[PDB]
Ligand binder design. Structure first.
Ligand code: NA
Ligand code: NA
Length: 247
């Protein structure tokens, strides 16, 4: 399930969000993964139990959590799934997790790990997907320096460092919004159907044709009862995408 550091930060950030956090701070060094949390935190009683929620606790793992109605907070150090110890720790309400030397104990899986720059790009892409999906949540990413963005509405412009034209179209159940910037050096086409990102190549080429190439297109779709690769009732969706590319 883990296989690489982007899957670690994915599990930890997903947990942070389920914990109702409005601020997520991710740090990587290429090896440390650290996810700091704004959320409800974990009862001291439950910290051991949740360390055996989080497995990926088998690589050199440390977690501290303070529950929002508790005043202390609790830290547990485990190594390759073996608890090394615990201590009570002063800290703000929330959760911090440090992963540190992923697959130190499993050399063959450690040798599956890519170049450090590749893993850095996978993490960066994941964090910007979470940001583009959650405008109301602050996100921060530390690689060596700082990546940083706050509560917003159009954070598309912050993420992609460009101004954008906003387009809106709605028909039957389908609601979709686009953010487009036409001068780009390279075209980049991002699609989110509901909150889930869609990597489909055919759809991206349809956006290349309908909004033109060498353009940034960020598409947000909302539909109620559909599948998710994913299927829907396609013709009306696609001619809606054409319709709002007609501004
Ligand atoms: Na958590
Ligand atoms: Na400890």
């Amino acid at each position: 399930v883990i296989e690489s550091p982007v899957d670690v930060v994915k599990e930890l950030v997903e947990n942070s969000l389920d914990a109702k956090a409005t601020k997520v701070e991710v740090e990587i060094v290429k090896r440390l993964i650290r996810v700091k949390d704004n959320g409800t935190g974990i009862h001291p009683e439950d910290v051991e139990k949740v360390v055996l929620y989080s497995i990926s606790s088998v690589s050199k793992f440390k977690l501290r959590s303070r529950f929002f109605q508790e005043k202390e907070g609790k830290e547990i150090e485990v190594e390759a799934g073996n608890i090394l110890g615990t201590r009570r720790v002063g800290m703000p309400v929330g959760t911090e997790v440090e992963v540190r030397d992923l697959f130190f104990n499993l050399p063959v899986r450690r040798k599956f790990l890519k170049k450090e720059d590749t893993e850095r790009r996978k993490v960066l892409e994941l964090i910007k997907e979470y940001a583009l999906t959650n405008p109301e949540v602050e996100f921060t990413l530390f690689s060596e320096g700082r990546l940083k963005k706050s509560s917003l509405k159009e954070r598309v412009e912050e993420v992609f460092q460009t101004k954008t034209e906003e387009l809106y179209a709605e028909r039957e159940g389908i609601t979709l919004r686009a953010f487009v910037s036409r001068n780009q050096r390279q075209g980049k086409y991002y699609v989110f159907i509901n909150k889930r990102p869609i990597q489909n190549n055919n759809l991206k080429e349809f956006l290349r044709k309908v909004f033109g190439y060498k353009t940034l297109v960020v598409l947000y779709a909302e539909l109620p009862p559909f599948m998710v690769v994913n299927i829907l009732k396609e013709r009306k969706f696609l001619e809606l995408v054409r319709e709002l590319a007609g501004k």
